[PDB]
Amino acid sequence: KFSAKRLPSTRLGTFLENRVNDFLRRQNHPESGEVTVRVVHASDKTVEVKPGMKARFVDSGEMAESFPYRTKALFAFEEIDGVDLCFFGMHVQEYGSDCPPPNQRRVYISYLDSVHFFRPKCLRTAVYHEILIGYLEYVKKLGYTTGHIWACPPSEGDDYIFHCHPPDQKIPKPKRLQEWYKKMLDKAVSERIVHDYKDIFKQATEDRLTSAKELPYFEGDFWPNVLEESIKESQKLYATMEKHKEVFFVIRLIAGPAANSLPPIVDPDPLIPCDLMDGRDAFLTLARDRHLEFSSLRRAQWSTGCMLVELHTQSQD
Ligand SMILES: CC(=O)N[C@H](CCCCNC(=O)CSCCNC(=O)CCNC(=O)[C@H](O)C(C)(C)COP(=O)(O)OP(=O)(O)OC[C@H]1O[C@@H](n2cnc3c(N)ncnc32)[C@H](O)[C@@H]1OP(=O)(O)O)C(N)=O
Ligand SMILES: [Br-]
Ligand SMILES: [Br-]
Ligand SMILES: [Br-]
């Protein structure tokens, strides 16, 4: 059986799908279907400090040369008339309690994407928010203190995770996407999951940061690249932060003394080797090469079926 449900379970996937299905049960909409959430890749990675920051802070011993993290890919599926549809995906980076500062106990969203066929329409955004809030709830429980989001929509015609979106799925502009994150985070605050959140500039100001070495350094993020582009010739950094403040969310999960003397992060879930889902490139390539598209409900369901066969058959022993 090559179903979504039959993909191996994880504590995280179970936590998220239980949150979503409980939410759906509360809404009691006759058209909602069972949601399945699965983590389909988890691996150890490191992010190397680029040359320039390496020459400036690493070679002096002020900063680590690299930061270890775990990457996880997760997907959500909904049953519609008994057929599974993959409608949401996310790649995250998790920096544990053993990781050197400035990255310890932080999570970062690498990529998030969706295809707009969730049934019913009126619960789609709500379910996306339930997944995101659930993710923050879960990592807070593990002892991660801070979440980080670069709220940047894809460029015209580009796909983050799913190949060939529906032509009529509008892509939000920056302001709309920013507001979307504020709505999600305001809900999380009301549920006492998030303590508070700040834009990157306000965060740096309140922290009284005085050196670029203090800013969290994530794989593929804007800030390592802008630090390199700036270094070609700290006040620059502050200026760049103010200019792009509204794009970058810093989400405080644990505050005050509660954040001070935490035990180590222990993740109960094992690594999950899966080359197909090691970052976003391999799945886009599979979809492109096999002429799969997520461009209509029926096409998306077909492509979901094909994705599932490949996930199961890559995983077999
Ligand atoms: C390297 C570099 O330089 N740069 C980058 C840096 C990478 C950063 C990566 N960061 C991340 O991944 C985190 S930010 C997440 C960004 N991901 C995406 O945006 C993927 C494409 N978008 C989506 O999947 C969805 O829009 C989603 C974000 C899931 C929200 O779906 P939704 O449905 O809840 O809300 P809605 O979409 O606002 O729609 C809600 C309503 O708004 C409507 N709507 C949406 N957009 C528009 C619009 N443009 N104009 C008018 N209306 C509009 C939509 O029709 C709808 O109407 P209704 O409810 O009446 O039907 C790089 N690495 O390449
Ligand atoms: Br509907
Ligand atoms: Br609607
Ligand atoms: Br909580």
Ligand SMILES: [Br-]
């Ligand atoms: Br592959």
